[PDB]
Amino acid sequence: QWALEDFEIGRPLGKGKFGNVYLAREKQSKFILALKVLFKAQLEKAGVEHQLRREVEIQSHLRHPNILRLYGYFHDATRVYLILEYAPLGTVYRELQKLSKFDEQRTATYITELANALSYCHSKRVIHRDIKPENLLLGSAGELKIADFGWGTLDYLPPEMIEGRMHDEKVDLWSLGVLCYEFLVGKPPFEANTYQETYKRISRVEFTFPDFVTEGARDLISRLLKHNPSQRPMLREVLEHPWITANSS
Numbered sequence: 001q002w003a004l005e006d007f008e009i010g011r012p013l014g015k016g017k018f019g020n021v022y023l024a025r026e027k028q029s030k031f032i033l034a035l036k037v038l039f040k041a042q043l044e045k046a047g048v049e050h051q052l053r054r055e056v057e058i059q060s061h062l063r064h065p066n067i068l069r070l071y072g073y074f075h076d077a078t079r080v081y082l083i084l085e086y087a088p089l090g091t092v093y094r095e096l097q098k099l100s101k102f103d104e105q106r107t108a109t110y111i112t113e114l115a116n117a118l119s120y121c122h123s124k125r126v127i128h129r130d131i132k133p134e135n136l137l138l139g140s141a142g143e144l145k146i147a148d149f150g151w152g153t154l155d156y157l158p159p160e161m162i163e164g165r166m167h168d169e170k171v172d173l174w175s176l177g178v179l180c181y182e183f184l185v186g187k188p189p190f191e192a193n194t195y196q197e198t199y200k201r202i203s204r205v206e207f208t209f210p211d212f213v214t215e216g217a218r219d220l221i222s223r224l225l226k227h228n229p230s231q232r233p234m235l236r237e238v239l240e241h242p243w244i245t246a247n248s249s
């Protein structure tokens, strides 16, 4: 249905592992959006193709306020184009580089917004499995918006995923705890200088808190960062946690 001709391309917003995402404007409507321009080569040469058709069919039917909407797609001779919602306030990754760390109030609200989005996702049996600051964006109101559902650093992946074992929706609960720690501390709990140092830290669940981390934050992260998935809470408990209710908005 769509074609490059129907849009006016703007500045590059960011370069990713398969191509770049540009600011764009559909000519007739004047609708501002994000144009993820990915190379057919870089994608197909790494056997990724199947995940992009997934991202297409998942992100398009996925309608929620905290989920980057996908309006459509197309593919010319050399490249592949996904027409996406534009997050005026950019990535959470960039915000965290600017601020270094986020306060208890900004963290709680992001976990809440992630939790509500993931709660909606776990209904259609949609598990993200790849939540990380780079895939978390910010709408006009500074509200969190998740991108890239088609699915590499180990940081946010739980033991089950890395060890090649059976995984559930509980994978995203763990990622929420790696994020909650990261947003408050400024680095993820298992951050190491090698894949193998990280693989060991995640496997043995070896992480520490700086002095400033609140007891309620120490609690939630510790509840979420459990090796056995069953022992992790579920989203309705995260949303009802005393640290989240006290500090969220």
Ligand SMILES: Cc1cn2c(-c3cnn(CC(=O)Nc4cc[nH+]cc4F)c3)c[nH+]c2c(Nc2cc(C[N@@H+]3CCC[C@@H](C)C3)ns2)n1
Pocket (backbone or CB within 6 Å): 013, 014, 015, 016, 017, 018, 019, 020, 021, 034, 036, 038, 084, 085, 086, 087, 088, 089, 090, 091, 135, 137, 147, 148
């Ligand atoms: C980078 C980027 C991406 N955007 C998306 C988007 C769409 N898809 N995805 C996922 C994806 O591209 N993934 C991906 C790409 C390639 N290969 C593998 C992959 F997995 C993110 C939507 N909106 C944006 C966006 N908006 C911005 C606003 C401002 C405005 N800014 C605010 C702060 C202060 C100042 C600088 C002004 N800056 S950036 N930025």
